[PDB]
């Protein structure tokens, strides 16, 4: 015969020769159509394939594995059911005892697909994360074989998990994980493979694990904060890297060489998160960025990107740094020109540009307070015109406010009126 309906059944009977054909058949057939997925689903193929993984034949193992990976791909339904059928439990119990590269690629690709389903992540970080951190991720970076693709899917998987409050706080504590993700990115940067296969994933996981850091992971900054400069761990361990100048440099490195916006946004992103804290860690981190690793350049360069999601991060980053006095000089010598142009064109007509503005304004206010002259040098007639309206433009409360706020806070000094 051939068809789906029979394949589903082909799965159930004892001859592995017809158990192989089964999943394999529904793997392709049900690759890119979305209707054969409905079928297999409402046909109970989910369950059938879920068991077969226990099977003694690698093929009936590959077959079921893939069939599942594809069956789920982009389908809230099939995902949910894949769990209800006791699969997240079965997929992981296969990675633990497998030497097959293809089986590892499939199971891992499967799991990746599941992690995008915003809710059932919890059982993944609970039961999936470990096997991935151990058998795939760690032994790939050599943080002491694993196929480059298995690591790809795994890091993809963790990239989604690093998205929930729990996953973030579980990896920051899972011994050797960040340590490894860290090697790989660093390794790739030396190999001059800034856009290597899984750098973006890894760079995203780190972006995510750097969210609200001074608020969660304890450090010297928080201590220096209770009884009131820090050294900086000599031997950063896991959670420890996220705030080390070693990583800042590796990020800033990716930033200037990468060709992927996705990656640029992460690099910019993590720096943004590390410097959100309005506390003391934000001041040190800002300094370690703009002063020790002298990174203003690669950041203010992002501001010209032909991608708004990218300019967002840069300016979002520039703004926070501008909050600390120690970076006013340095920022004035290398950021003012580029932020200004980026405040003469951004109308605030996008969900982003309203952000780019709220940031490129806060930035100028913070900076200009310390040295009027910088205003006299970059506030171009146009840049000047293009900001009043903003205060009016009721179509952008956000931009407006910071825009007029940048204006009023622009008459708070004797040397301020000049131009206008």
Curated annotation (Swiss-Prot):
Start-end of each ARM repeat: 1-31, 32-73, 74-116, 117-159, 160-190, 229-255, 256-302, 303-348, 349-412
One of the GO biological process terms: signal transduction
Gene Ontology CC annotation, any one: cornified envelope
PTMs per UniProt: Phosphorylated by AKT2; required for interaction with YWHAG and subsequent localization away from desmosomes to the cytoplasm. Phosphorylation by RIPK4 at the N-terminus is required for its role in differentiation of keratinocytes and DSG1 localization at cell junctions.
GO molecular-function term, one example from the UniProt record: structural constituent of skin epidermis
Signal peptide (UniProt feature, chain positions): none
Superkingdom as given in the UniProt entry: Eukaryota
Subcellular location: Nucleus; Cytoplasm, Perinuclear region; Cytoplasm; Cell junction, Desmosome
The keyword Oxidoreductase is assigned to this record: no
Keyword terms of this UniProt record: Cell adhesion, Cell junction, Cell membrane, Cytoplasm, Developmental protein, DNA-binding, Ectodermal dysplasia, Membrane, Nucleus, Phosphoprotein, Repeat, RNA-binding
Nucleus keyword on record: yes
Noted disease: Ectodermal dysplasia-skin fragility syndrome: A form of ectodermal dysplasia, a heterogeneous group of disorders due to abnormal development of two or more ectodermal structures. Characterized by features of both cutaneous fragility and congenital ectodermal dysplasia affecting skin, hair and nails. There is no evidence of significant abnormalities in other epithelia or tissues. Desmosomes in the skin are small and poorly formed with widening of keratinocyte intercellular spaces and perturbed desmosome/keratin intermediate filament interactions.
Role played: A component of desmosome cell-cell junctions which are required for positive regulation of cellular adhesion. Plays a role in desmosome protein expression regulation and localization to the desmosomal plaque, thereby maintaining cell sheet integrity and anchorage of desmosomes to intermediate filaments. Required for localization of DSG3 and YAP1 to the cell membrane in keratinocytes in response to mechanical strain, via the formation of an interaction complex composed of DSG3, YAP1, PKP1 and YWHAG.
Assembly: Part of a complex that contains DSG3, PKP1, YAP1 and YWHAG; the complex is required for localization of DSG3 and YAP1 to the cell membrane in keratinocytes. Interacts with DSP. Interacts (via N-terminus) with KRT5/CK5, KRT8/CK8 (via rod domain), KRT15/CK15 and KRT18/CK18 (via rod domain) as part of intermediate filaments. Interacts with VIM (via rod domain). Interacts with DSP. Interacts with DES. Interacts with FXR1; the interaction may facilitate the binding of PKP1 to PKP2, PKP3 and DSP mRNA.
Family, as annotated: Belongs to the beta-catenin family.
Protein known as: Plakophilin-1
Gene: PKP1
Full-sequence range covered: 244 to 721 of 747
